Ligand binder design. Sequence first.
Ligand SMILES: CCCC[C@@H](CN[C@@H](CCCC)C(=O)N[C@@H](CCC(N)=O)C(=O)N[C@@H](CCCNC(N)=[NH2+])C(N)=O)NC(=O)[C@@H](NC(=O)[C@@H](NC(C)=O)[C@@H](C)O)[C@@H](C)CC
Lengths: 99, 99
Amino acid sequence: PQITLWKRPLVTIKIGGQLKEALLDTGADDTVIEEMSLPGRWKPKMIGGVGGFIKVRQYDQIIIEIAGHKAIGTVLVGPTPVNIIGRNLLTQIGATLNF
Amino acid sequence: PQITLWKRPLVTIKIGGQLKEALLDTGADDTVIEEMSLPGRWKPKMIGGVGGFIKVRQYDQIIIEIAGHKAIGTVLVGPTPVNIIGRNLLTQIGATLNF
Ligand SMILES: CCCC[C@@H](CN[C@@H](CCCC)C(=O)N[C@@H](CCC(N)=O)C(=O)N[C@@H](CCCNC(N)=[NH2+])C(N)=O)NC(=O)[C@@H](NC(=O)[C@@H](NC(C)=O)[C@@H](C)O)[C@@H](C)CC
């Protein structure tokens, strides 16, 4: 799809058997999801942006379906105000910025 | 151009006659730049990100070039970790996300 930017670029995702809404964020290195369960081992991480840092749990090799397109990668889980799809998964679905 | 996301989508901007680096950020409503001097009066604004909220100065109708494309619009100045070009100006330069 071609997504214009008049509004926030929100899409439906499926992760860990759950549907969620998430923001496509070219300004995010990583993908960050609100508290949920995921399989496998994790390690803590601190991630920062506007307003400072939050502590998250890093899970690897997680499959997400993003607007119908499957991707695998690292997902961070923690108290983010918005679910964010970052570059690590945007690349996998072939997303580009065009102007 | 077509900008892939394997690296951060950093571009050169020009504001106040000066060249700066900024991040093209589809997950940002607004454009936020590190402390600098801009002309005119400002109004107060609170913005939020992954770590919480910060106060910024809002300047309107500022002339800015983004990757060689001319825009005129609102620029927020404050303690952002990085210069970000948000949707308010991405729409002026005709940017879309595509996959
Ligand atoms: C400044 C740092 C770079 C840009 C920023 C853009 N992220 C979005 C996420 C939105 C969810 C919180 C953002 O902050 N957007 C703000 C930007 C400010 C602005 N005004 O445009 C926004 O639109 N804020 C809206 C509110 C969004 C609320 N939405 C909602 N409640 N549904 C606003 N009007 O204040 N990226 C990040 O915050 C990411 N940071 C990074 O990628 C890097 N960190 C740093 C410091 O560069 C990396 C080294 O960790 C996070 C997510 C970790 C991977």
